[PDB]
Short mmCIF file of C-alpha atoms in Angstrom, two decimals:
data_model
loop_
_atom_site.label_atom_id
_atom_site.label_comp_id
_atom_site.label_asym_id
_atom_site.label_seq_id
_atom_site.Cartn_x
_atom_site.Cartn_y
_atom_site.Cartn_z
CA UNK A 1 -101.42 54.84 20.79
CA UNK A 2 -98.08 56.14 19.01
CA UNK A 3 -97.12 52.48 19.68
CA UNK A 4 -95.66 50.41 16.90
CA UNK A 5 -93.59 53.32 14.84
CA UNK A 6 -89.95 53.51 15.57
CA UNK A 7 -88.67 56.92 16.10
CA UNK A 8 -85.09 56.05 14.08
CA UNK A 9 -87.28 54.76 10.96
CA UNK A 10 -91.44 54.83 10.06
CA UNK A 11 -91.08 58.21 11.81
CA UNK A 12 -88.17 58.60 9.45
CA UNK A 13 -89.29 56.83 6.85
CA UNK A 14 -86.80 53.87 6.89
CA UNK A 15 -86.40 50.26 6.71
CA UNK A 16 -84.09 48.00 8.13
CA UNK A 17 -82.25 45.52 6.26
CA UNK A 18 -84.59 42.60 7.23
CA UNK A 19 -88.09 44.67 7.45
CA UNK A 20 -88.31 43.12 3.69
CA UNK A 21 -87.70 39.72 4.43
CA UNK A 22 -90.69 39.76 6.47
CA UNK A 23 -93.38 41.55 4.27
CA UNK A 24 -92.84 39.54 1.11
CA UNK A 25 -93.54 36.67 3.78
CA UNK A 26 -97.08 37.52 4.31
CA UNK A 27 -98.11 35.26 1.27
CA UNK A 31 -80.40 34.42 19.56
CA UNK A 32 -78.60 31.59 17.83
CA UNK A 33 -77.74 32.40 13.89
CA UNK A 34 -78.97 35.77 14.01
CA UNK A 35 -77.15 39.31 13.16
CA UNK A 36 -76.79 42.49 15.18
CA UNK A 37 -79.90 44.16 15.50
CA UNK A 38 -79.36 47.99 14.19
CA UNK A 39 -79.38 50.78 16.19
CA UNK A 40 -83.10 51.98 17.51
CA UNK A 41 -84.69 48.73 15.33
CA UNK A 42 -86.03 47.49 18.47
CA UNK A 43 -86.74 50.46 20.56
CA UNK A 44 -89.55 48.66 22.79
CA UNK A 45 -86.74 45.50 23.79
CA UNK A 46 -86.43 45.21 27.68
CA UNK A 47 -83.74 43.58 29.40
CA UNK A 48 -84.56 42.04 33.18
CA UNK A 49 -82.15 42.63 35.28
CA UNK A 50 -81.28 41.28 38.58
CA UNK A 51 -79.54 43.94 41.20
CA UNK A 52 -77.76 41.58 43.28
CA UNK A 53 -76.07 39.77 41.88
CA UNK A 54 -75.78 41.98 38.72
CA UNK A 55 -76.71 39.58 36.20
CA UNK A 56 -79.09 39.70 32.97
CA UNK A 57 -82.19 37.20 33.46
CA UNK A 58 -84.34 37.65 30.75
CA UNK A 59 -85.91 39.66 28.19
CA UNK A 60 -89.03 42.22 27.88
CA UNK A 61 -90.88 44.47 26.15
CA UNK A 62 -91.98 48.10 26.42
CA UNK A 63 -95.64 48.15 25.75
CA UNK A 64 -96.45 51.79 27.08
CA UNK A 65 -94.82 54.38 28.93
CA UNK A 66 -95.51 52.37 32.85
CA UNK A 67 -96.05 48.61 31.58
CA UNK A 68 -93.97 46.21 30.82
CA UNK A 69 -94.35 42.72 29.32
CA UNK A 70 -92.43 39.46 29.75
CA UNK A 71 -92.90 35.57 30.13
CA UNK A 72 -94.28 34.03 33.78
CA UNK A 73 -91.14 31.96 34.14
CA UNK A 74 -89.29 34.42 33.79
CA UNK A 75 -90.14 35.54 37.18
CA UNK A 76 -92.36 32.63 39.05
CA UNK A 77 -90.76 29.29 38.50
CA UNK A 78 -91.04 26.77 41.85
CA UNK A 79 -89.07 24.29 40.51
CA UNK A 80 -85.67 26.14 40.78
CA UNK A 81 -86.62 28.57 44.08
CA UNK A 82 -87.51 31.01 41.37
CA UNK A 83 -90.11 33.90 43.00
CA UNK A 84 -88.75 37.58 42.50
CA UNK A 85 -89.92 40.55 44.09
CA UNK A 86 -90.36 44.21 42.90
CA UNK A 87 -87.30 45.22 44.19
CA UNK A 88 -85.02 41.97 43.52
CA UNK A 89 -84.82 43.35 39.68
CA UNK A 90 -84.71 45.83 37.54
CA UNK A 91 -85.27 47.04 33.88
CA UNK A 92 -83.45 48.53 31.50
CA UNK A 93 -84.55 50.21 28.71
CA UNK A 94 -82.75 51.49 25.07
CA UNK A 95 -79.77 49.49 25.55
CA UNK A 96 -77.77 47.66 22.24
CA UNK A 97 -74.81 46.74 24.08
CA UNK A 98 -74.98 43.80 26.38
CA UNK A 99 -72.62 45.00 28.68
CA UNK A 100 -71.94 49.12 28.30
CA UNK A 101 -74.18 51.25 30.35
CA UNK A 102 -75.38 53.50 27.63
CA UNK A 103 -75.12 56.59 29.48
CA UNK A 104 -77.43 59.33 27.96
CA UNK A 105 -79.39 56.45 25.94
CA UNK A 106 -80.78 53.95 28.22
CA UNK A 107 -83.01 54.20 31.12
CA UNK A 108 -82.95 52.22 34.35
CA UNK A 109 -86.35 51.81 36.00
CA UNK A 110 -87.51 50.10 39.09
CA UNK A 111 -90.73 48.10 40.05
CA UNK A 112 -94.26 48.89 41.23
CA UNK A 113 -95.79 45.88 41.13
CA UNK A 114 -95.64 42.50 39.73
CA UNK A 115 -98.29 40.67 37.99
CA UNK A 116 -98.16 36.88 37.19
CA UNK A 117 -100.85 34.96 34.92
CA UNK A 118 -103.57 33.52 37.77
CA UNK A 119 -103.58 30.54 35.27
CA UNK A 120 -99.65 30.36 34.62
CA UNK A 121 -99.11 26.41 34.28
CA UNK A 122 -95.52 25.66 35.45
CA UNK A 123 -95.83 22.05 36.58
CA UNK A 124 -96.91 20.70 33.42
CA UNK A 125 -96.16 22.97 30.24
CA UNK A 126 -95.69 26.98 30.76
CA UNK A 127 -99.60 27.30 29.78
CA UNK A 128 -100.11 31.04 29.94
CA UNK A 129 -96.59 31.96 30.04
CA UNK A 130 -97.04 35.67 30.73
CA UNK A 131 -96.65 38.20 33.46
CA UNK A 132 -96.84 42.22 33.37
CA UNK A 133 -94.56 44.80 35.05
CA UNK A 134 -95.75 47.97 36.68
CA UNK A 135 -92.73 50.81 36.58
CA UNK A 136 -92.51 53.16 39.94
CA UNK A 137 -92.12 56.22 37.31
CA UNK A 138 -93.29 56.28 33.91
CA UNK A 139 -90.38 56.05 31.48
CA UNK A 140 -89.49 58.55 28.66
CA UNK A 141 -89.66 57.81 25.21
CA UNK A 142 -86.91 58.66 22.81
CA UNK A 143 -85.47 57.86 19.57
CA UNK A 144 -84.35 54.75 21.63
CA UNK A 145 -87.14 54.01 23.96
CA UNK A 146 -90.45 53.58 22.20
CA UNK A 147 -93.50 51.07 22.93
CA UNK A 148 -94.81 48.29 20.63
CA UNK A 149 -98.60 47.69 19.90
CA UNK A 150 -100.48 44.67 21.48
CA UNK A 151 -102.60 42.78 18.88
CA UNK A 152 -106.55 42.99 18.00
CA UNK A 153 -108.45 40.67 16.68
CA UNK A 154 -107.71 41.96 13.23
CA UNK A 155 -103.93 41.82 13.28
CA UNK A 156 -104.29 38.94 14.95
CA UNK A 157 -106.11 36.88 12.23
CA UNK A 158 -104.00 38.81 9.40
CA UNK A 159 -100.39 38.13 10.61
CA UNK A 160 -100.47 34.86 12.33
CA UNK A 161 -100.12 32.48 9.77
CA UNK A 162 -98.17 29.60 9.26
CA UNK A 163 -95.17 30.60 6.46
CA UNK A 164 -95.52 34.19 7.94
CA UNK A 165 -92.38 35.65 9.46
CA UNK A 166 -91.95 37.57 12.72
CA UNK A 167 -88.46 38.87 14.30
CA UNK A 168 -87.08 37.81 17.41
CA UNK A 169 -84.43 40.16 19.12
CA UNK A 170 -82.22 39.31 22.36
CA UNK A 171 -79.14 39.20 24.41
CA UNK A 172 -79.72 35.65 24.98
CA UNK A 173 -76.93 33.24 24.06
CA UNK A 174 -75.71 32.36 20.86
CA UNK A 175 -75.58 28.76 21.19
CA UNK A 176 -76.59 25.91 23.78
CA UNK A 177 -75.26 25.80 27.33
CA UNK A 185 -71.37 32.94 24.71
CA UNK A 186 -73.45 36.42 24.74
CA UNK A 187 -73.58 38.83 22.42
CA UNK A 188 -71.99 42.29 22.48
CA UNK A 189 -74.84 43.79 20.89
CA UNK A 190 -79.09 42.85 21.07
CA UNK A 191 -79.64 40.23 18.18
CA UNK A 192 -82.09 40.08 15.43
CA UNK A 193 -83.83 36.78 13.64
CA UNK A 194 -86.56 36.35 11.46
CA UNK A 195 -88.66 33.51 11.75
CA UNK A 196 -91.58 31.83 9.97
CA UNK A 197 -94.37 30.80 11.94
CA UNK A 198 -94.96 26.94 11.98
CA UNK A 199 -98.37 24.76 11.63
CA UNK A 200 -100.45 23.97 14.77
CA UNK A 201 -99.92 20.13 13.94
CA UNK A 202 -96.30 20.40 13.03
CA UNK A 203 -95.43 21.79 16.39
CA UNK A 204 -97.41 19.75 18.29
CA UNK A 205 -96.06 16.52 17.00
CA UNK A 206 -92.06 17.73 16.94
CA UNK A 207 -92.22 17.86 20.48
CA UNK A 208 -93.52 15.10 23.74
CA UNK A 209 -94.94 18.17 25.50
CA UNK A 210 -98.48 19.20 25.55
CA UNK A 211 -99.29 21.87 23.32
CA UNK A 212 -101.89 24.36 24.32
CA UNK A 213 -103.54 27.50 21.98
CA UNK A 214 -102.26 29.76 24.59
CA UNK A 215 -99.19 29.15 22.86
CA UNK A 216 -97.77 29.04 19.06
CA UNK A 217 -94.04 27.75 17.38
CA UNK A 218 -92.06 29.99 14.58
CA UNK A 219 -88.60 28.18 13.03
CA UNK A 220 -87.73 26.92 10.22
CA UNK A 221 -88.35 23.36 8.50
CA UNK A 222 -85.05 20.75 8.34
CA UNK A 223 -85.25 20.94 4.83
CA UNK A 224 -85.54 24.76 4.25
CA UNK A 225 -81.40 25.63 4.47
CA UNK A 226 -81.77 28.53 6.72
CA UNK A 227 -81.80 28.17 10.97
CA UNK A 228 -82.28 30.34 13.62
CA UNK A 229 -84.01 30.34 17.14
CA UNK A 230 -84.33 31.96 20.21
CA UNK A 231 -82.13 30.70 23.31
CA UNK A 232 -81.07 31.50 27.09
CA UNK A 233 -81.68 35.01 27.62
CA UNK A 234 -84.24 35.32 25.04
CA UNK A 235 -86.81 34.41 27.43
CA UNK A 236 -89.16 36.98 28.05
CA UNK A 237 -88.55 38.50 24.71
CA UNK A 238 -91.06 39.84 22.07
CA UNK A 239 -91.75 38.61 18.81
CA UNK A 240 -92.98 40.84 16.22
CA UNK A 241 -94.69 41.49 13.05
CA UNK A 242 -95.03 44.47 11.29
CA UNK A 243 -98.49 45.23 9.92
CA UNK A 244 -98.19 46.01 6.04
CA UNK A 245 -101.80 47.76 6.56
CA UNK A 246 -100.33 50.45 8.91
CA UNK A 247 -96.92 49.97 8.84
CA UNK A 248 -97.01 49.40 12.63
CA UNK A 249 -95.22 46.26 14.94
CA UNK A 250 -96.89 44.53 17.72
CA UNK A 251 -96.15 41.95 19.54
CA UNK A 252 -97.72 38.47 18.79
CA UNK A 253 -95.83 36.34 20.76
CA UNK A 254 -93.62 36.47 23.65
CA UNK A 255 -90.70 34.03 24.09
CA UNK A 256 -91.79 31.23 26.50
CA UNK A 257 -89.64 27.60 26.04
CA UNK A 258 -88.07 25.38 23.63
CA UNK A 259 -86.22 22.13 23.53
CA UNK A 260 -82.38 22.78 23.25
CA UNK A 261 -81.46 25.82 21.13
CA UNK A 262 -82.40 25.42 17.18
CA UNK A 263 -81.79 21.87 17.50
CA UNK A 264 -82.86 20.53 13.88
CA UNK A 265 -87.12 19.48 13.90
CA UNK A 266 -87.29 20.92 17.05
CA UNK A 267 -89.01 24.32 17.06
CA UNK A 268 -89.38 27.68 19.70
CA UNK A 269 -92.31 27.90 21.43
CA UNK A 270 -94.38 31.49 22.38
CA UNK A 271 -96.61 33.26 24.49
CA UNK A 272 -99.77 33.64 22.14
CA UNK A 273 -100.13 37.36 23.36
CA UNK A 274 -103.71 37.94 21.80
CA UNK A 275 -105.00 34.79 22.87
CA UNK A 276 -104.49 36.50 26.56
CA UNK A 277 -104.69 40.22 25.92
CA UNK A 278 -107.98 39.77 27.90
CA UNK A 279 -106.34 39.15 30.93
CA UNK A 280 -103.85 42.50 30.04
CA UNK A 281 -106.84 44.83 29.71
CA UNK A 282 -107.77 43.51 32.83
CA UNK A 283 -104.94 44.16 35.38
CA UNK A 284 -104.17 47.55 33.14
CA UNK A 285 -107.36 48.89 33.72
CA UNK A 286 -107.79 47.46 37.26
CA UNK A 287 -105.24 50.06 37.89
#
């Protein structure tokens, strides 16, 4: 509704030092501290015991909260949390202070995994919602992101096009951050990501990165999981989320690109256990 304007700029009417790099597109290893409140929809998944960061989020709406499947549902590794084996945090920047009077610890209601989540083959469907015991506050910290239409959809996901990727996840292959991260990325071609990888590629999902021969680098690794990837919408000056981040091979290993949830491709399914609710 409010979704997709940050408090601590469009509400202030301000950009952030990379907002740029991403408009003049349309036609977290090697990234940079994100800036305060530039991100206020980021999530980190937490796990209560042992206290240890899992994964990344996102914010979508004042009691939901979105996030990749394997995040949470992964057989392969005993992976099958429960409501109340994590938690969320919400508004942080720093990976390890609790920001006191900033962030906002919230527990589960209910889990919900994609019925069609494909984890024995290739992460088809890589998504998975989060119901929050008590509705969270917003604040110049805490703010929701927009999910994408048709419209948006068709506008901003193009190949060239850039969308942000923000995390806590490492900074290299397997070491954290001190602060949530911030890349830019440019979507990649259908055809090029299919063919950089031996896995089969599916429209449930899409690849950002850059090319080997374009200088710059950047991806999203451990940690990022989870995470959203954005675009802001030069028609309304909003962000939503397009993507969410799902797998990859290594950690912006050269020809090798990140792979994401293709949100829109499944907001069906969203509407659907929202409003069954």
């Amino acid at each position: 509704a409010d979704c997709g304007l940050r408090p601590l700029f469009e509400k202030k009417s301000l950009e952030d030092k990379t907002e740029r790099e991403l408009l003049e597109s349309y036609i977290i290893v090697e990234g940079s501290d994100a800036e305060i409140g530039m991100s206020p929809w980021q999530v980190m998944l937490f796990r209560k015991s042992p206290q240890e960061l899992l994964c990344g989020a996102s914010l979508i709406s004042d009691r939901w909260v979105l996030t990749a499947a394997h995040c949470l549902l992964y057989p392969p590794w005993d992976k099958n949390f429960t409501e109340n084996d994590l938690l969320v945090r919400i508004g942080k920047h720093s990976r390890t202070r609790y920001e006191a009077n900033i962030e906002k610890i919230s527990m589960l209601e209910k889990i919900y995994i994609h019925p069609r989540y494909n984890w024995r083959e290739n992460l088809d469907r890589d998504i998975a919602l989060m119901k929050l015991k008590k509705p969270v506050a917003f604040s110049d910290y805490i703010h929701p992101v927009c999910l994408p239409d048709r419209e948006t959809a068709a506008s901003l996901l193009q190949a060239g096009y850039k969308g942000r990727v923000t995390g806590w996840g490492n900074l290299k292959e397997t070491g954290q951050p001190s602060v949530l991260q911030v890349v830019n990325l440019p979507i990649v071609e259908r055809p090029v990501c299919k063919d950089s990888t031996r896995i089969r590629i599916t429209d449930n999902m899409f690849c950002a990165g850059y090319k080997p021969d374009e200088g710059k680098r950047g991806d999203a690794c451990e940690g990022d999981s989870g995470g959203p990837f954005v675009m802001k919408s030069p028609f309304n000056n909003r962000w939503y989320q397009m993507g969410i981040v799902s797998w990859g091979e290594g950690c912006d290993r050269d020809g090798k690109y990140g792979f994401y949830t293709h949100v829109f491709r499944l907001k069906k399914w969203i509407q659907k256990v929202i409003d069954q609710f």
